[PDB]
Structure 1
């Protein structure tokens, strides 16, 4: 018989200018300015990424299975899944926040952080 593999291709969610980028990594919290040494990190499980940019409100992204890759000319965020503050279900985020499964609570907290609801 056949082996079938159904694969979702890599895809860019958003790309834009930033003055500051803040998130929480396994080695701790980090803030990346335009002049920054190259870096590779793994975001914490309930990580939120705050993107500050000239002329716009902060962009906040709940991030699931996130990795960071600060090269010389880019801050690259590789995500298993993410949703932007615009997309989040504020009700469902608090529902998943209640630790049903621990992996469910991280995605709930990450989302509450992107709503500015939790620290």
Structure 2
């Protein structure tokens, strides 16, 4: 298996084993499996991370300022900010989406994608 570490600037948010790490880099959607080759990529502005763990429900994380680093022994996602699916509130995400401010619009779109409404 592969160990995933979702780390924020202020603190390390999440850390644990997983089975499939989906995300959307600038080039395009990427799915990391246990022995993926080493890689460094930049997550898109409104990126989203989906961690499929062993014997557990998937974890959806909205990511802001994301960066992905695969090392064949652990996947490390460095995020300026992030929010788990449970913590994300729908109404605020809708309000902040489709905003002129590019940063808040990207954050809102990432929250929408993490929730499931896309």
TM-score, normalising length from structure 1? 0.89
Count of aligned pairs: 118
Question: Once structures 1 and 2 are overlaid, which stretch shifts more, 9-18 or 26-35?
Answer: 9-18
Give the conservation status (yes or no) of the 8 Å contact 2:97–2:107: yes
1:42, CA displacement in angstroms? 0.3
**Structure index of larger Rg:** 1
Structure 1 segments unaligned to the other structure (5+ residues): none
Q: 1:114 to 1:4 in 2, by over 3 A?
A: closer
Aligned partners of 1:64, 1:70: CA distance in 2, in Å? Answer: 18
1:19, CA displacement in angstroms? 0.5
Aligned partners of 1:45, 1:3: CA distance in 2, in Å? Answer: 24
Runs of 4+ more than 3 Å apart: 1-10
TM-score, normalising length from structure 2? 0.89
